[PDB]
Amino acid sequence: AESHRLYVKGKHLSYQRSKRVNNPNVSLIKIEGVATPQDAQFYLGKRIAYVYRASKEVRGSKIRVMWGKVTRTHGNSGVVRATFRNNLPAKTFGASVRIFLYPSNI
Template sequence: MIGTNPNLIADSSATFGDFPYHLAIFRVSPYVLKVDFGSTSPSLKRLDKMASRLYIKGRILGHKRGKRNSRPNQSLLQIEGVDNKEAARHYLGKRVAYVYKAKREINGSRVRVIWGRISRSHGNSGAVKSKFRTNLPAKTFGASCRIMLFPSNI
């Protein structure tokens, strides 16, 4: 515990804002230790009961193209939080999913997925080039996609 005063967050309150409590979450496999510095006892919760996102958000920028020629079999993506070539190198080989809803239901679901794979970086600003199983239609430009954290070589 930091202190007995529930309004005391840390030495610098500007880091956490002006909230009366600070919440810390620690992973203690397979449980999550949740410490609320305003209460007296920590609580344990199972990891599988907590909502978690197992992908990184990305944005589809468009097809790779030159001045006159477009290459619809190669798509450019911007990954959230990636702003240089070195950071984009971590995502090479990762799977990409473009998830969308269709009008007609097939096998009890309207959700469809086009899968792809990140092949290389593009430029110096963290954009990456990817190839999808089927070419992405032009209406996906600007849409969001999911960059899965597999396959992993860690």
């Protein structure tokens, strides 16, 4: 109980985009340990959270969370696509993100 994590780590790389136009509506996530679209199929539909600090407390907390979910895979190397209730801020390209194991249809 050194470890308590029940999510897989991921990184927020980019919005969906062509060379010169981006689409903030979809985000591209690289899930740790996932190298192929075949592997990434496991994570589709799972929930993600981006988790951040703020100065103003809300429900007596300075931690905040943006939720979303993995929607399809992306390209040939396990990258995955994700939509969020809001839209990841963009300063967060490179930030860590958390990919849960539910909804589980193990």
